[PDB]
């Protein structure tokens, strides 16, 4: 069943606690950064630098 | 080490209360019952019941001290206006 | 004359006043030339240093 592979064990429990911790951080970072940079579109330096094109 | 001066509390087995006889306790496992079961019938029943009891002991004091801060702040602003310069030179002396 | 207003620590401005002496914008702390409060609510006129005279000397101490 499910109990004996995910929960019962106490090495791929504490194992998969840190496994997801390393993976959660990177996707969580990329997602928040993309939402912030899009909510403030037109005020950033990258957009201005492209807009002062002379 | 040596034993020190004893307490009004012990430990498991000799906690230091009176002897009990004739009391029975029953309980059920948490795995066998459903959590988050009634927490409305809690915030609307019990919180409102607990509020209704202990709210006249907190709000009658709060009303006396806030009224006091008011009448002082109102009077100060009058003293330093131009319509209250005569009173200022009376009370500041 | 030392400028430690006891209850302020304020700094009277030279080149101003009523008598060619002193004014501070502090409370209306007017002093006289010699340095005696005159029209400001401060309680006392302030400490003159224990400076002495010895010839090419004024030992402001």
């Amino acid at each position: 069943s499910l109990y004996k592979t995910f929960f019962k064990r106490n090495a791929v429990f504490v194992g998969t606690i840190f496994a997801g911790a390393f993976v959660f951080q990177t996707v969580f970072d990329t997602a928040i950064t993309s939402w912030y940079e899009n909510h403030n579109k037109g005020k950033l330096w990258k957009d201005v630098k492209a807009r002062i094109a002379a | 080490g040596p034993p020190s001066g004893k307490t009004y509390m012990g430990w498991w087995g000799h906690m230091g209360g009176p002897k009990q006889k004739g009391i029975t306790s029953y309980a059920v496992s948490p795995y066998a019952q459903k959590p988050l079961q009634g927490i409305f019938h809690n915030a609307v029943f019990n919180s409102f019941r607990r509020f209704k009891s202990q709210f006249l002991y907190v709000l009658i004091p709060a009303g006396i001290y806030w009224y006091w801060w008011k009448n002082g702040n109102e009077y100060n602003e009058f003293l330093y206006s131009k319509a209250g310069r005569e009173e200022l030179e009376r009370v500041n002396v | 004359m030392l400028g430690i207003c006891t209850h302020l620590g304020c700094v009277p401005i030279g080149e101003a006043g009523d008598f060619g002496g002193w004014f501070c914008p502090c409370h209306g702390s007017h002093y006289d030339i010699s340095g005696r409060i005159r029209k400001g609510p401060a309680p006392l006129n302030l400490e003159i240093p224990a400076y002495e005279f010895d010839g090419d000397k004024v030992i402001v101490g």
């Binding site: 005020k43 950033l44 330096w45 | 006889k21 004739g22 029953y26 | -």
Partner: protein, 248 residues
């Protein structure tokens, strides 16, 4: 105190960086530095801002290297111990007009103009007070107030009399991007540049706080769940009493 000795209350303007998810407008910073260089820098210093911190914020690397080289800095002495000079580099700090406090007061009738690196954080009101000050000089002072010779009236300064005179007027600056350089427009860009000078971590801080508040908010809800599960035996436990026989 009266209201004059306190000062007039600054209003609440709708700044584009106010809000928990907002950033600075970087085109207003770039325009604001131009107002500083051509109006303010004659009598105000900016001692706590280095040249390098402008790269990637308002100007390009090649632009900032050319602005710094227009100033001369003290070099270390030569082979015989005589002093030298050199042009500016990126690790240098923005220079001020005067060499000491005595020369600054001499050029401003005894008064000393302050450094502006932290003026937004060091005044009650913040950006609303800086803007309202520059745009608050009336035509005539109100009838009755006797100003000293050499002082100017505007009601946002405590007391009512300030040593600065009005310095902003329409169309004195020609902007590179074609913005109309009205009085209010330049005042707004000046204050935005100055707030960046005080808080150069504003944009990074507000997004690390979005990460931290989301993580801690879910841990707080998970902790309430786990508590109520592990406490369910104690909350529903029941007791019964049957009086024994007092033989004992």
């Amino acid at each position: 105190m009266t209201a004059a000795e306190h000062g007039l209350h600054a209003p609440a303007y709708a700044w584009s960086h106010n809000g928990p998810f907002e950033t600075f407008d970087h085109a207003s910073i770039r325009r604001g530095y131009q107002v500083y260089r051509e109006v303010c820098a004659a009598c105000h210093s900016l001692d706590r801002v280095a040249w390098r911190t402008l790269v990637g914020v308002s100007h390009t690397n090649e632009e900032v290297r050319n602005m710094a080289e227009e100033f001369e800095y003290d070099d270390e002495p030569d082979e015989q111990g005589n002093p030298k000079k050199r042009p500016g580099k990126l690790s240098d700090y923005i220079p001020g007009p005067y060499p000491n406090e005595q020369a600054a007061r001499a050029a401003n009738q005894g008064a000393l103009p302050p450094d502006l690196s932290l003026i937004v954080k060091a005044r009650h009101g913040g950006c609303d007070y800086i803007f309202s000050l520059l745009t608050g000089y009336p035509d005539e002072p109100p009838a009755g107030v006797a100003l000293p010779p050499g002082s100017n009236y505007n009601p946002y300064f405590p007391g009512g009399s300030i040593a600065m005179a009005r310095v902003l007027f329409d169309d004195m600056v020609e902007y590179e991007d074609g913005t109309p350089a009205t009085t209010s427009q330049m005042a707004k860009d000046v204050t935005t540049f100055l707030n960046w000078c005080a808080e150069p971590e504003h944009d990074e801080r507000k997004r690390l706080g979005l990460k931290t508040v989301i993580i801690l908010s879910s841990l707080y809800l998970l902790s309430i769940w786990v508590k109520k599960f592990k406490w369910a035996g104690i909350k529903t436990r029941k007791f019964v009493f049957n009086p024994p026989k007092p033989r004992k």
